[PDB]
Write a protein that holds these residues in place. Structure first.
Motif, mmCIF file in Angstrom:
data_model
loop_
_atom_site.group_PDB
_atom_site.id
_atom_site.type_symbol
_atom_site.label_atom_id
_atom_site.label_comp_id
_atom_site.label_asym_id
_atom_site.label_seq_id
_atom_site.Cartn_x
_atom_site.Cartn_y
_atom_site.Cartn_z
ATOM 1 N N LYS A 130 0.855 -1.202 0.000
ATOM 2 C CA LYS A 130 0.000 0.000 0.000
ATOM 3 C C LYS A 130 0.890 1.251 0.000
ATOM 4 C CE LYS A 130 -4.288 -0.109 1.306
ATOM 5 N NZ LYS A 130 -5.366 0.042 2.306
ATOM 6 N N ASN A 131 2.015 1.267 0.724
ATOM 7 C CA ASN A 131 2.874 2.483 0.673
ATOM 8 C C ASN A 131 3.476 2.593 -0.733
ATOM 9 O OD1 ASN A 131 2.470 3.421 3.351
ATOM 10 N ND2 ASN A 131 4.224 2.243 4.102
ATOM 11 N N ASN A 133 2.202 1.600 -3.504
ATOM 12 C CA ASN A 133 1.089 2.050 -4.375
ATOM 13 C C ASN A 133 0.875 3.553 -4.212
ATOM 14 O OD1 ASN A 133 -0.850 1.421 -6.344
ATOM 15 N ND2 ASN A 133 -2.464 1.406 -4.731
ATOM 16 N N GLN A 134 0.873 4.046 -2.989
ATOM 17 C CA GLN A 134 0.662 5.495 -2.763
ATOM 18 C C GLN A 134 1.793 6.274 -3.452
ATOM 19 O OE1 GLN A 134 -0.803 8.997 -2.128
ATOM 20 N NE2 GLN A 134 -1.962 7.134 -1.667
ATOM 21 N N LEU A 167 1.014 6.365 -7.149
ATOM 22 C CA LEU A 167 -0.114 7.270 -7.442
ATOM 23 C C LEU A 167 0.380 8.713 -7.403
ATOM 24 C CD1 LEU A 167 -2.922 5.458 -5.542
ATOM 25 C CD2 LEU A 167 -2.614 5.564 -8.015
ATOM 26 N N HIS A 211 2.214 9.222 -10.608
ATOM 27 C CA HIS A 211 1.259 9.373 -11.718
ATOM 28 C C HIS A 211 0.678 10.793 -11.717
ATOM 29 C CE1 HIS A 211 -2.108 8.780 -14.419
ATOM 30 N NE2 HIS A 211 -1.473 7.689 -14.894
ATOM 31 N N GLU A 238 0.911 3.044 -15.506
ATOM 32 C CA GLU A 238 -0.373 2.306 -15.604
ATOM 33 C C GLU A 238 -0.116 0.874 -16.098
ATOM 34 O OE1 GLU A 238 -3.564 4.649 -17.593
ATOM 35 O OE2 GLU A 238 -2.352 6.355 -16.857
ATOM 36 N N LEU A 243 0.587 -0.110 -11.862
ATOM 37 C CA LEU A 243 -0.616 0.133 -11.023
ATOM 38 C C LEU A 243 -1.436 -1.145 -10.839
ATOM 39 C CD1 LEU A 243 -1.800 3.704 -12.010
ATOM 40 C CD2 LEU A 243 -0.210 2.954 -10.230
ATOM 41 N N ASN A 244 -1.623 -1.927 -11.885
ATOM 42 C CA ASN A 244 -2.480 -3.140 -11.716
ATOM 43 C C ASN A 244 -1.671 -4.231 -11.008
ATOM 44 O OD1 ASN A 244 -5.121 -4.510 -12.042
ATOM 45 N ND2 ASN A 244 -3.956 -5.903 -13.362
ATOM 46 N N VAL A 267 -2.352 -3.407 -7.428
ATOM 47 C CA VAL A 267 -3.731 -3.775 -7.046
ATOM 48 C C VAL A 267 -3.786 -5.293 -6.855
ATOM 49 C CG1 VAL A 267 -6.100 -3.952 -7.904
ATOM 50 C CG2 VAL A 267 -4.908 -1.740 -7.842
ATOM 51 N N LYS A 268 -3.225 -6.074 -7.764
ATOM 52 C CA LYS A 268 -3.255 -7.537 -7.584
ATOM 53 C C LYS A 268 -2.447 -7.935 -6.347
ATOM 54 C CE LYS A 268 -1.672 -8.308 -11.651
ATOM 55 N NZ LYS A 268 -1.124 -8.972 -12.868
ATOM 56 N N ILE A 298 -1.850 -6.266 -3.566
ATOM 57 C CA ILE A 298 -2.588 -5.847 -2.359
ATOM 58 C C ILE A 298 -3.762 -6.799 -2.133
ATOM 59 C CG2 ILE A 298 -3.980 -3.952 -1.414
ATOM 60 C CD1 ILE A 298 -1.964 -2.063 -2.899
#
Ligand SMILES: [Cl-]
Ligand SMILES: [Cl-]
Ligand SMILES: [Cl-]
Ligand SMILES: [Cl-]
Ligand SMILES: [Cl-]
Ligand SMILES: [Cl-]
Ligand SMILES: [Cl-]
Ligand SMILES: [Cl-]
Ligand SMILES: [Cl-]
Ligand SMILES: [Cl-]
Ligand SMILES: [Cl-]
Ligand SMILES: [Cl-]
Ligand SMILES: [Cl-]
Ligand SMILES: [Cl-]
Ligand SMILES: [Cl-]
Ligand SMILES: [Cl-]
Ligand SMILES: [Cl-]
Ligand SMILES: [Cl-]
Ligand SMILES: [Cl-]
Ligand SMILES: [Cl-]
Ligand SMILES: [Cl-]
Ligand SMILES: [Cl-]
Ligand SMILES: [Cl-]
Ligand SMILES: [Cl-]
Ligand SMILES: [Cl-]
Ligand SMILES: [Cl-]
Ligand SMILES: [Cl-]
Ligand SMILES: [Cl-]
Ligand SMILES: [Cl-]
Ligand SMILES: [Cl-]
Ligand SMILES: [Cl-]
Ligand SMILES: [Cl-]
Ligand SMILES: [Cl-]
Ligand SMILES: [Cl-]
Ligand SMILES: [Mg+2]
Ligand SMILES: [Mg+2]
Ligand SMILES: [Mg+2]
Ligand SMILES: [Mg+2]
Ligand SMILES: [Mg+2]
Ligand SMILES: [Mg+2]
Ligand SMILES: [Mg+2]
Ligand SMILES: [Mg+2]
Ligand SMILES: [Mg+2]
Ligand SMILES: [Mg+2]
Ligand SMILES: [Mg+2]
Ligand SMILES: [Mg+2]
Ligand SMILES: [Mg+2]
Ligand SMILES: [Mg+2]
Ligand SMILES: [Mg+2]
Ligand SMILES: [Mg+2]
Ligand SMILES: [Mg+2]
Ligand SMILES: [Mg+2]
Ligand SMILES: [Mg+2]
Ligand SMILES: [Mg+2]
Ligand SMILES: [Mg+2]
Ligand SMILES: [Mg+2]
Ligand SMILES: [Mg+2]
Ligand SMILES: [Mg+2]
Ligand SMILES: [Mg+2]
Ligand SMILES: [Mg+2]
Ligand SMILES: [Mg+2]
Ligand SMILES: [Mg+2]
Ligand SMILES: [Mg+2]
Ligand SMILES: [Mg+2]
Ligand SMILES: [Mg+2]
Ligand SMILES: [Mg+2]
Lengths: 174, 174, 174, 174, 174, 174
Positions: A106-107, A109-110, A113, A116, A132, A136-137, A140-141, A143
């Motif tokens: 999650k960190n 990912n942040q 983002l 981006h 992207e 990014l995906n 998501v997978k 997490i």
């Protein structure tokens, strides 16, 4: 110093943000390496937890290498910093490692983002598409998988049930 | 704290020396990673230098993982430190990178020889055999290969001859 | 005139910008065709330079055809203009052709980035995705490859060294 | 109620918009199912029209399932509504069914474009990329194919020519 | 300027005539490209007409490349001009495109026959043989095929019969 | 309106009963779809429960399609109604979903038995044979399988034992 012959529409701020993301991916590689060998200890002895986190460590090194390739593709200059030792620590259990990995991903990912949003603010569609397509995906997978693992370990009765972590090691990570 | 159930004839000093060697192997992985992507720059553009050093980076991570496995096999506890950013830097040329790698591999060898002397002083034949089997001849071969490469680049006229580094990239590293 | 039965969220300005990009891709095909046959001359005679640029010519025709398919997919109408003869000219050397190709691919990239900005301004995510998926990273890779080639030819001593261009023809483009 | 452990940068409004799109994809599956079996009637008897629309029905169920997977990946909660019976009806001919399908796919596309605009307004690049990758070009290709089919049936003389629909069934959908 | 080392029995007038024929072959490639994508429109939608003319476009580019190779083989210098946009236009129907192609291929043939007469007048048997071997019978076969296609479309009732063009698309060009 | 040319011994009441059964099979497809994605949630995370119910969803769509084919085979007219959203809900556990599925399959069976009694009362042996061949034993096997699953989950200690549902997911549904 002297401008790259390849550089086009690549903001100095984006170049610096990519260097920061390279460091974070190398840090995530190091956290998973540390977590892997905790499960290889003779007083922990969960070999599929060890294999799972080692694979995750190797994947983060690939994520860092692809960002280093991107920096050179766009005519930026790689700038490296120390890779901090893992922070989290006292691994304690399969469940606690999985929770640390969830928080790490999650960190990361942040950070992506924010990267981006910077690329969007500097109208850099190539860098937006790179993030992207390749990151990014994949976050998501990762997490979602880690949440699934935390849920199962909690429902099975971890961390108190050593039987729960043993059977999860065989049936989910085996 | 509480003594490992597996630990036998494994001195606290040897345990600490193995942790220091893990950090050095991870540092060597990082130096080769940095050197690799220098050759991937659009203003350097020697793809077989890049591939050679990337392979060397991956090999150092394997060397670190095997020491982490050894620490757990003997009932020691892995203790990690920050991985320093590469020191050497301003890569400048194929020849200068090869000279930095030669110096790195000689420093790693000197660390291993000190580790072997400690294991000998603590009468730990398993650890002596581990270092001899998996590390000492791998260092002698790496040092000899890097010397050979430095010799050829110097004889061909590097670093002044961009033609020398180009042709070495094709014929020796290709 | 009469509205397409398929047209949806496709601005007149985007339709016209796609027609301009079709012309540019056909122009780039023509520049590479001209460059190819320069290297086929009996007084130049670098057959792998010739093959490299001919392949690049064929790839630009594919880029133009895919934009023509897109125009019809979205219900726009293809409008063609003359394909100008190559401007650059007096090819002179392998290095000078590679520099002309680098400049061409950077101009094509700037056209694509303007096209993307228009599609963003007209809230056309399909067209943004089309440009990102099929064009922007293909331009970044082409620009990086051409920079790499220019760097090597300069370091090897081109254009004065006919030996440099000969050996680059064999070892990089062969 | 209680926040998902996986949820990050996923706006409540986006979550609700995804639930609405799930219902629309299931509705489109139902419209194509109804259209399929019209062509299976003994007084219509166009078996390749029937097979074409049945395949399209199955594809819409896949589109709905992928959105349900996305809702869970992002930590939203699926909320289902009734699937309305097809509206359009009195199928009447191959041409009229194809025109109904064209209108359906344009309405689904408009829903996706509104979803993309919401994801853009909430700075959700993962959701923007999901819609672009898996939905927007699939809608552009479906709309173009359906327009092509309507054009051919009109030129062949449908719906008055039962010979036109028969031969289109064999040669285009067979 | 300086005479080619390879040039022998190759008149300046023949060299210039070959440059004019290169431009014409590139022009014919462009006419077929334009005709191809007309049939890809959603309001025309004859995919085998589109494929037929695209193949013909690619064949004309091969015809131009072979003349460019010939110019260099004989020690002439390629001189390129703009490629004019297609003239003919308003494509209107399968029959009208086929009639435009017939007229194009007869004009290209007349150009080749003038080229042959010049080569005969300058006693250049190699160039006469080149034109006879690679071009004249290829033009006779193209003209005969296009006449055959025009005849069938007229007999089937094109352009008024959209059924005629549809069935010709399937059975002759499919 | 106008009598089918194929219709024979097919009562209006049977035609209407088949339309009602089509709606029920589509409803059962929807219930299993909803149940499937509950188990895909990150806070439930039982992937073989998810796969089991998704397969059951797809099977119910096949059951509906076969009844639609039957309606046309006999010269009846398909009449569709809305597909209600699943009723049952708050899925809560593997055991509670399995109990909902058992109740669903018993209601579907009771509908089929009423359909069979109507076909018997109207002396329609073809429809009796259709229901017996394709539906009645498929319902008996589904009900028996679901009872078996409920029994095992109850004996293993579900729903309180998250370990019971985890191990059933691996060993019975895996
Ligand atoms: Cl700038
Ligand atoms: Cl930086
Ligand atoms: Cl630092
Ligand atoms: Cl996932
Ligand atoms: Cl996915
Ligand atoms: Cl002791
Ligand atoms: Cl230590
Ligand atoms: Cl430290
Ligand atoms: Cl050796
Ligand atoms: Cl040896
Ligand atoms: Cl050589
Ligand atoms: Cl409009
Ligand atoms: Cl235009
Ligand atoms: Cl023009
Ligand atoms: Cl690249
Ligand atoms: Cl790439
Ligand atoms: Cl060689
Ligand atoms: Cl929030
Ligand atoms: Cl909702
Ligand atoms: Cl509802
Ligand atoms: Cl398409
Ligand atoms: Cl496409
Ligand atoms: Cl026919
Ligand atoms: Cl002469
Ligand atoms: Cl000329
Ligand atoms: Cl001109
Ligand atoms: Cl013939
Ligand atoms: Cl012949
Ligand atoms: Cl009756
Ligand atoms: Cl009814
Ligand atoms: Cl209803
Ligand atoms: Cl059974
Ligand atoms: Cl049975
Ligand atoms: Cl097992
Ligand atoms: Mg950082
Ligand atoms: Mg991972
Ligand atoms: Mg990563
Ligand atoms: Mg510290
Ligand atoms: Mg993707
Ligand atoms: Mg140290
Ligand atoms: Mg090595
Ligand atoms: Mg080492
Ligand atoms: Mg420092
Ligand atoms: Mg040995
Ligand atoms: Mg232009
Ligand atoms: Mg290219
Ligand atoms: Mg291009
Ligand atoms: Mg001009
Ligand atoms: Mg975007
Ligand atoms: Mg891509
Ligand atoms: Mg709706
Ligand atoms: Mg479809
Ligand atoms: Mg859909
Ligand atoms: Mg209603
Ligand atoms: Mg795509
Ligand atoms: Mg001319
Ligand atoms: Mg031809
Ligand atoms: Mg020709
Ligand atoms: Mg003009
Ligand atoms: Mg003769
Ligand atoms: Mg012949
Ligand atoms: Mg009912
Ligand atoms: Mg079933
Ligand atoms: Mg059923
Ligand atoms: Mg209701
Ligand atoms: Mg049976």
């Amino acid at each position: 110093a002297s401008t790259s012959q390849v550089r086009q529409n690549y903001h100095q701020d984006s170049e610096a943000a990519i260097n920061r993301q390279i460091n974070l991916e190398l840090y995530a590689s190091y956290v998973y390496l540390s977590m892997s060998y905790y499960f290889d200890r003779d007083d922990v002895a969960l070999k599929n937890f060890a294999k799972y986190f080692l694979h995750q460590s190797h994947e983060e090194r690939e994520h860092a290498e692809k960002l280093m390739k991107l920096q050179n593709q766009r005519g930026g200059r790689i700038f490296l910093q120390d890779i901090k030792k893992p922070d989290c620590d006292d691994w304690e259990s399969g469940l606690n490692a999985m929770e640390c990995a969830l928080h790490l991903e999650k960190n990361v990912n942040q950070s992506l983002l924010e990267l981006h949003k910077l690329a969007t603010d500097k109208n850099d569609p190539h860098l937006c598409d790179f993030i992207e397509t390749h990151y990014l995906n994949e976050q998501v997978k990762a997490i979602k998988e880690l949440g699934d693992h935390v849920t199962n370990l909690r429902k099975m009765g971890a961390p108190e049930s050593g039987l729960a972590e043993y059977l999860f090691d065989k049936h989910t990570l085996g």
